[PDB]
Design a protein around this ligand. Structure first.
Ligand SMILES: *[C@@H]1O[C@H](CO)[C@@H](O[C@@H]2O[C@H](CO)[C@@H](O)[C@H](O)[C@H]2NC(C)=O)[C@H](O)[C@H]1NC(C)=O
Ligand SMILES: *[C@@H]1O[C@H](CO)[C@@H](O[C@@H]2O[C@H](CO)[C@@H](O)[C@H](O)[C@H]2NC(C)=O)[C@H](O)[C@H]1NC(C)=O
Ligand code: NAG
Ligand code: NAG
Ligand code: NAG
Ligand code: NAG
Lengths: 225, 83, 327
């Protein structure tokens, strides 16, 4: 059953990426931004910044250098300031990408090479494992997780009194169909009979709020009797 | 331009006012953010509608002091994440 | 902190305020103002993304049942109150009164003077009454479902049994809790009251929020002061220069003003970019805290308050979030 669910899920990842075009936008925009910024830089060559013209070889071939100094200085100021702005913006974007890379390294170290227990760090639900894949300037994680979904209701009690003593689950919880009582682990419905060997005794049953009266089967007594 | 200022569907929001969209009484999820909880989309016979965005389905969980819910069956899920 | 106040700057109103000759001289500088506007709208998008990332963690809106038989606990100070038009906790009302926000900008101060020079304040995408709905939904889900709603469908479970699970997560046997329920209830209620009156009496608690607003306010304020410096021309009022000199020599003065104002605007935008990066880092920290200290039970030391962590409760503040760790 788990094998069939896993294979169907992997196929759904495959055709979901193959059908949806807008999945990889988090990568694409990055390239676009750099592309856009670089393109802007090129068309900053075409503004004259208040001089005669934006072509340098025009000004060299029209004026004598006593006044070409005046014109060229304005060009130098404009182009240098624009280049400075480009470099500052690229520095800020580089810091952002470095932050995302450290996040990616942390996810690779924890969600892949081990089994994390932090909630929603490695996908939605309880985490089982991960698989990495490569992308142009990036990484793509497939998280494989476990989601429980078919619920049903029961009536409980925090402890069971049997012989003037309280009994507590060694691990799990006490549940009732309505007639009987069972011990169950916390994430999968499975009744087991309340014995000594999955419970323990502590104090008396005159203190705990809401303790219900039942019996606890002893595994030794019918062997002895 | 002045071909839109005729209006007759004008709607005043906390960000200003909107011309060319027709205010509805439903609540959908957001498509294009306008602001102050108002979003807009292009839907149906087709036009641009604007609405109060819908945060999600309303839900109530049947709490008691002696009732528990437990799962019986399970599902394996695979999700993608891009960095 | 989660977000700062979205700000939009219009060049042509700021630099060449109503002067055709000034703008015609400005287009010789190319496409600066498009870049400036693009950077500011990038920050303005990123603020909405930050708030959406922090608070939109689930996709259903649970509600608390009306009956309050939570085994002796008393959540009256963090549950919503139907007695107010703003459906908040009283703790959230203390938070909304302690921060003195500014920058109203109402539809018709220093705010009007900021309005008259191309500086506009965009309102946030999420109002103050939907953030409260998310926070109340997270409170409802935490107190009635444990952590199961953080992984799938909501499963109801009685509250003291959940607290038994949470001591079992620490390393304490759960029979400690069931024999000492009343003591724990009294300590919890007294501690919540201590949070309430301690925050009410101390004025200087919320400085981490307030300074952020102040810095942006201060930065925006000094921008307006840069309209009053002459940068080496004969006057700082552009209409004076147009009403005194002929344009073939007024180009000399106006160019100096363009240079000065453009450089000051660039400096402001670079500083706002760096502050945006800082606020984004703190927002990702807040999202991690909301995912781990609330929706589960973390075991990292001192990530969820000092001591062995039991649970958390989030509350909303203007431009930020406030966690109560119960430990
Ligand atoms: C637990 O869940 C699985 C999967 O949802 C159930 O398996 C399905 O059983 C039906 C029987 O009518 C088949 O038609 C489906 O094809 C099965 N699913 C798969 C993926 O093969 C299983 O029956 C459930 N357990 C119980 C007790 O109902
Ligand atoms: C939870 O604590 C609140 C504390 O505010 C209790 O509300 C007080 O109840 C007393 C009892 O009559 C009133 O005299 C006070 O005026 C109430 N406080 C306020 C601020 O109005 C509330 O009763 C407690 N709830 C439970 C179930 O214990
Ligand atoms: C809302 C809901 O599920 N309520 C159920 C109820 O129908 C059922 O009779 C009872 C015992 O199983 O448990 C609870
Ligand atoms: C919940 C319950 O059945 N409690 C019983 C009580 O009725 C009885 O009087 C006592 C004497 O053995 O034992 C216990
Ligand atoms: C929010 C706001 O400012 N609303 C006002 C409204 O009260 C007034 O009646 C109208 C008249 O022009 O202008 C607008
Ligand atoms: C549960 O609530 C009911 C309310 O009808 C009350 O009678 C009962 O004593 C409560 N039990 C526990 C264990 O809190």
């Amino acid at each position: 059953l788990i094998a069939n669910q896993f294979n169907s899920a992997i196929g759904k990842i495959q055709d979901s990426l193959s059908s949806t075009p807008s999945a990889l936008g988090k990568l694409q925009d990055v390239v676009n931004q750099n592309a856009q910024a670089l393109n802007t830089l090129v068309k900053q060559l075409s503004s004259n910044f208040g001089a005669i013209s934006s072509v340098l070889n025009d000004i060299l071939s029209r004026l004598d250098p006593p006044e070409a100094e005046v014109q060229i200085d304005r060009l130098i100021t404009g182009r240098l300031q624009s280049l400075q702005t480009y470099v500052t913006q690229q520095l800020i974007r580089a810091a952002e990408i470095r932050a995302s890379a450290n996040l990616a390294a942390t996810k690779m170290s924890e969600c892949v090479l081990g089994q994390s227990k932090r909630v929603d760090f490695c996908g939605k639900g309880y985490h089982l494992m991960s698989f990495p894949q490569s992308a142009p300037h990036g990484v793509v994680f497939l998280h494989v997780t476990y989601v429980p979904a078919q619920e049903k209701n029961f009536t409980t009690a925090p402890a069971i009194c049997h012989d003037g003593k309280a009994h507590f689950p060694r691990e799990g919880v006490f549940v009732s169909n309505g007639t009987h009582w069972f011990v169950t682990q916390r994430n999968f419905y499975e009744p087991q009979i309340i014995t000594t060997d999955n419970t323990f005794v502590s104090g008396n049953c005159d203190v705990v709020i809401g303790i219900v009266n039942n019996t606890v089967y002893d595994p030794l007594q019918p062997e002895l009797d | 331009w002045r071909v839109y200022s005729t209006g007759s569907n004008v709607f005043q929001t906390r960000a200003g006012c909107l011309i060319g969209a027709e205010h509805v009484n439903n609540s959908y999820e957001c498509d294009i953010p306008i602001g102050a909880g108002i979003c807009a989309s292009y839907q149906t016979s087709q036009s641009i509608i604007a609405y109060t965005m819908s945060l999600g389905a309303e839900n109530s969980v049947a709490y008691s002091n002696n009732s528990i819910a437990i799962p019986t069956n399970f599902t394996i899920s695979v999700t993608t994440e891009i960095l | 902190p989660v977000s700062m106040t979205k700000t939009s700057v219009d060049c042509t109103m700021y630099i060449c305020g109503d002067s055709t000759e000034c703008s015609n001289l400005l287009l010789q500088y190319g496409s600066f103002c498009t870049q400036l506007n693009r950077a500011l709208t990038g920050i303005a998008v990123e603020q909405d993304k930050n708030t959406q990332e922090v608070f939109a963690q689930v996709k259903q809106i649970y509600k608390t049942p009306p009956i309050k038989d939570f085994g002796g606990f008393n959540f009256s100070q963090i549950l919503p109150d139907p007695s107010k038009p703003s459906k908040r906790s009283p703790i959230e009302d203390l938070l909304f009164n302690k921060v003195t926000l500014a920058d109203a900008g109402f539809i018709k101060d220093l705010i009007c003077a900021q309005k008259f020079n191309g500086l506009t304040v965009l309102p946030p995408l999420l109002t103050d009454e939907m953030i409260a709905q998310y926070t109340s939904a997270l409170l409802a889900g935490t107190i009635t479902s444990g952590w199961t709603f953080g992984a799938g469908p909501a499963l109801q479970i009685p509250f003291p049994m959940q607290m038994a699970y949470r001591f079992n997560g620490i390393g304490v046997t759960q029979n400690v809790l069931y024999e000492n329920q009343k003591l724990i209830a009294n300590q919890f209620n007294s501690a919540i009251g201590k949070i309430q009156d301690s925050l009410s009496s101390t004025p200087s608690a919320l400085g981490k929020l307030q300074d952020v607003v102040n810095q942006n306010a201060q930065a925006l304020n000094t921008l307006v002061k840069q309209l009053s410096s002459n940068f080496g021309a004969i006057s700082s009022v552009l209409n004076d220069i147009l009403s005194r000199l002929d344009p073939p020599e007024a180009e000399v003065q106006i160019d100096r003003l363009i240079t000065g104002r453009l450089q000051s605007l660039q400096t402001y935008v670079t500083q706002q970019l760096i502050r945006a990066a800082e606020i984004r880092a703190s927002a990702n920290l807040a999202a991690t805290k909301m995912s781990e200290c609330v929706l589960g039970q973390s075991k990292r030391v001192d990530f969820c308050g000092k001591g062995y962590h039991l649970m958390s409760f989030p509350q909303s503040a203007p431009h930020g979030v406030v966690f109560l760790h119960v430990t």
